[PDB]
């Protein structure tokens, strides 16, 4: 058998050989597929949601180190962190390396994702049981609505709402979401960036990522003048810097340099 | 083999258990050549790709993305050179690199050698926007093996050598002038990290003073990432910061990918790979 991935945005398909199907069922919220890919390939275990791959053993370090560290290294002293989505635990694992982090909340709508990540991606999900984390099953929209002003230093969106994200951040707050591809959806990113800036964020900057197959991130600061393109707390000064396989300060700087057709985003 | 409405399947033997497929709208060419199997087709009009070129079942050019790897190859090499007057391109029968090279006012002549005359022929036909450079009076376009060509070239002929391909490295160093920049199509840091390190190491060894690997951001590559080894003949040259920034040259604003920030960014590698560049 072969898992086939397709996008409405057509005439193209990416196919992965299925070694063993590990989970395949709808959930309260979406279709969840987990499979062991060809042992001769690099991919390891693969997770898709509604047919779109979200996690592979092989590349997960990329998007988890970028979202975790681009945001937290852009913050003067991130103590309280919210993660919306992230039920696999990867961003949480990266967030929790930082010795400044006192507490992280994680809210994912789908408790089956977390359950299934516990069983099939222990390399990613081990962080869910960290004492500095509180993991909640529920809607992030509903969650941010019922959250006090000035609760978090950083909100990470790993999937009215953006007013509430702005509201729940402290004055020096960093918001970081999963952006669309500049190839696939330049139009969406332009719109998101304007949207976010208008709802109140002072600077919005798009960071690009290098994935083995195809993504990036919007990094949003509440206070202006702050150049998020240069690390405010370089990871190189921190004890875990050599533990990371993708992210460092040079990659952080490089990530905001956009091909010319997309530059006007930043 | 290929039919209209059928699917083009791209597989890679270094990466088993995956395939990237494209829906074929119109088969344009599908025959063996003297050297390779050339396959050209119009892809799904509702997709972004347009016309697609494959050699031995490996896609080499699409209308959508060609600007990336041609701008990266053309300008990273030429903006690292004080005065690129005479330019060699090995491979590149489609003319894409050549079109970028010739944007530069300092170029007097560019030689181009591609082993397969059918590639150039079929690029003139089905990718006019890439191959229009093949008719430029400042270009001499030749059918031949690049191995024999550089073997037969005098010492200190070229300011820049660009290897754009699907003992020889001794020759490239030899035929470059003292200020020479060599540039090649590099393998993926994902697929073949080791090849790049062995390659970078033997290039330096054969006698190039510095070697730096640049990364590109492509819309799709089912084999990881495509890169470029940018190599300096003279010592004390830093290819990672543009020697002649494109922002000063009248055609900068015509480029869709490359600029100085992209140039600098391209040499920042993922931590797992950074030892390649230091
Ligand atoms: C698996 S994670 C994939 C990203 C790479 N780590 C994506 C998660 O976002 C969750 N998600 C989607 N919408 C929401 C909302 N509205 N709230 C919380 N979590 C959400 C969804 O259940 C996935 O687990
Ligand atoms: C099409 S180009 C790759 C597309 C990026 N412009 C790859 C070309 O290299 C040629 N090639 C391969 N081997 C050689 C040799 N030995 N010499 C010259 N050209 C070569 C081959 O015919 C393609 O046209
Ligand atoms: C080679 O097949 C693959 C492999 C990985 C992904 C993937 N990893 C994260 C997310 C962006 N997509 C994919 O979509 C297809
Ligand atoms: C949509 O599927 C695609 C699209 C593009 C490529 C490609 N562009 C440059 C060359 C190296 N490969 C591909 O292989 C498959």
Author numbering:
A (entry chain A): 10 to 18, 20 to 169, 183 to 237, 242 to 293
B (entry chain B): 5 to 170, 183 to 294
Show sentences the authors wrote.
As a result, TcSpdSyn IC50 values for two compounds were determined, with compounds 1 and 2 inhibiting TcSpdSyn at IC50 values of 82.27 and 43.41 μM, respectively. To examine the binding sites used by these two active compounds, we conducted X-ray crystallographic analyses to observe the structures of the TcSpdSyn complex with the two top-ranked compounds (compounds 1 and 2) in the hidden binding pocket, as predicted by the MD simulations. Compound 1 interacts with Glu22 and Asp77 (interaction energy values: −25.93 and −17.56 kcal/mol, respectively) through two hydrogen bonds. Therefore, these interactions would appear to be important for binding to the site. Some other interactions were also found: Trp61, Ile71, Thr244, and Tyr245 interacted with compound 1 with interaction energies of −4.45, −6.51, −4.83, and −7.36 kcal/mol, respectively. Comparing the structures of compounds 1 and 2, both are para-substituted anisoles with nitrogen-rich heterocycle para-substituents. Compound 1 interacts with Glu22 through the hydroxy group at the meta-position of anisoles, while compound 2 interacts with Glu22 via a secondary amine at para-substituent. Upon examination of the X-ray structure of TcSpdSyn with compound 1 at the binding site, the amino acid sequence overlap with the clustering structure was 72.2%. Glu22, which interacts with 1, is a feature of the sequence of the clustering structure binding site.
